[PDB]
Design a protein around this ligand. Structure first.
Ligand code: LI
Lengths: 121, 121
């Protein structure tokens, strides 16, 4: 769910997930996908595609378990859809952290700017 | 769309929407709902619950017409969804203005992963 996602983002990146990734480039946020603007944006693209692959479980609503043991995210067994959901979110948290070096606040928006069409997932 | 909403917030509250409310508390902005921190946040909770009742239009993307007449938001859509959407937005802008008295600037970029579970709408 958004809950786990937001938390994982904060645990990995150390950044306020809404503030840093709630409206960033073409893919981080709640405005679907678009041609990634940079590596961080690109994490969000893969994440949104990760979500498309899920079957049945609700990526926004459905809670799942993960542990943060040794400051690494391990997705709990869950059921397959929830485990995969979790893996999607873990992936994007990790990728965002990984790409903090090129994170660029100029891609943050209030209203979403220009985004060419993303490739189909 | 976020454009009309933000315009309304500005008109009602006289504050930059993105800054003041774009990430406020547990409900204003991107992390879905959490338990409202305060009255401002609870406006945003109600707003999100309002958006849930909308059939067949998109709050994030869909433009709609409204007028600001004698400093009053007046929704002007023929389209039943866009009219209802407009009303959700008007309602939050008015609410935000109404609770400017308790606006807690420390919630402005509240860390949403701290939020407790929201009650259902
Ligand atoms: Li009114």
């Amino acid at each position: 769910s958004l809950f786990e996602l937001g938390k994982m983002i904060l645990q990995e990146t150390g950044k306020n997930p809404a503030k840093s990734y709630g409206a960033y480039g073409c893919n981080c946020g709640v405005l679907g996908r678009g041609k990634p603007k940079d590596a961080t944006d690109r994490c969000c693209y893969v994440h949104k595609c990760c979500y498309k692959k899920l079957t049945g479980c609700d990526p926004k609503k459905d809670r799942y378990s993960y542990s943060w043991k040794d400051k690494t995210i391990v997705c709990g067994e869950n059921n397959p859809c929830l485990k995969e959901l979790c893996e999607c979110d873990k992936a994007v948290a990790i990728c965002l952290r990984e790409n903090l070096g090129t994170y660029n606040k100029k891609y943050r928006y209030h209203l979403k700017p220009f985004c060419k069409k993303a490739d189909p997932c």
